[PDB]
Amino acid sequence: SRLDKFKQLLAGPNTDLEELRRLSWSGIPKPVRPMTWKLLSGYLPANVDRRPATLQRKQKEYFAFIEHYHQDTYRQIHIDIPRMSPEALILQPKVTEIFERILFIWAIRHPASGYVQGINDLVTPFFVVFICEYIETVDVSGVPAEVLCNIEADTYWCMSKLLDGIQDNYTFAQPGIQMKVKMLEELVSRIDEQVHRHLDQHEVRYLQFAFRWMNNLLMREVPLRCTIRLWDTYQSEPDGFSHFHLYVCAAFLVRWRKEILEEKDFQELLLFLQNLPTAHWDDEDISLLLAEAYRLKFAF
DSSP, rough: OOHHHHHOOOOOOOOOOHOOOOOOOOHHOOOGHHHHHHHHHHOOSSBBGHHHHHHHHHHHHHHHHHOOOOOHHHHHHHGGGOOOOOOOOTTTTHHHHHHHHHHHHHTTTOTTTOOTTTHHHHHHHHHHHHGGGGGOOOOTTSSHHHHHHHHHHHHHHHHHHHHTTTTGGTTTOOOOHHHHHHHHHHHHHHHHHHHHHHHHHHHHHHHHHHHHHHHTTTTSSSSSSHHHHHHHHHSSSSTTTIIIHHHHHHHHHHHTHHHHHOOOHHHHHHHHHTTTTTOOHHHHHHHHHHHHHHHHHOOO
């Protein structure tokens, strides 16, 4: 019924992307998530009859990259990929190779950035969402090779689209990140001046914990199932990864205002902010976080 509404929008003939965005904000049912993400990111056209040709042509373009294609870029990627999360997925030997190849191709095609640790995490939600359209816990072993290459292309293009809205995060000296941490600081000074002063009082700088929140898009702070839900809304929002993300970070911080303000040791305060207790988090927790982020957007 919510699912029947998504399916009806997706069938077109010319899908209303405004209406799809407004529905996706509140989360996308799993059965339609892969095609919804593809449409909302602009990978596939709104016009239903154009989609198959466009998909096949974009996939072939990526396969041409693989054929056509630095030693130091590959060594950095070979060290990070093997030890990234979630370990059960990554340790599957076909997953590690796909991940390295996507990240290596992105890096040579974006020479102002190259490979920056943190971009490797942004591969995981696209890949897991897209591989889940072809499996019945995530084991890649049964997926035919042809289908797995198609997933890899889809993952590259959608990740590329995400990255094209946060370009300054990953250039030399990563000036997008510093700017976002500073705007986070200005935002929290205004919405929760008590949390702001306690951090100052105990010598915690926003950059010490929030660099990772911006660089990895909160993926090191919450479980993957949470990041997938969060990205439903990021893709529904205007400049979601870029601008709305800031407000999610502000809401994430002030969610533990009680535990922050009770913590008076600098070392444990920083440890806590870098290790927020979210292993048990579910969709209810993310929906609340987003509702708060949304409010903070209008307060500021």
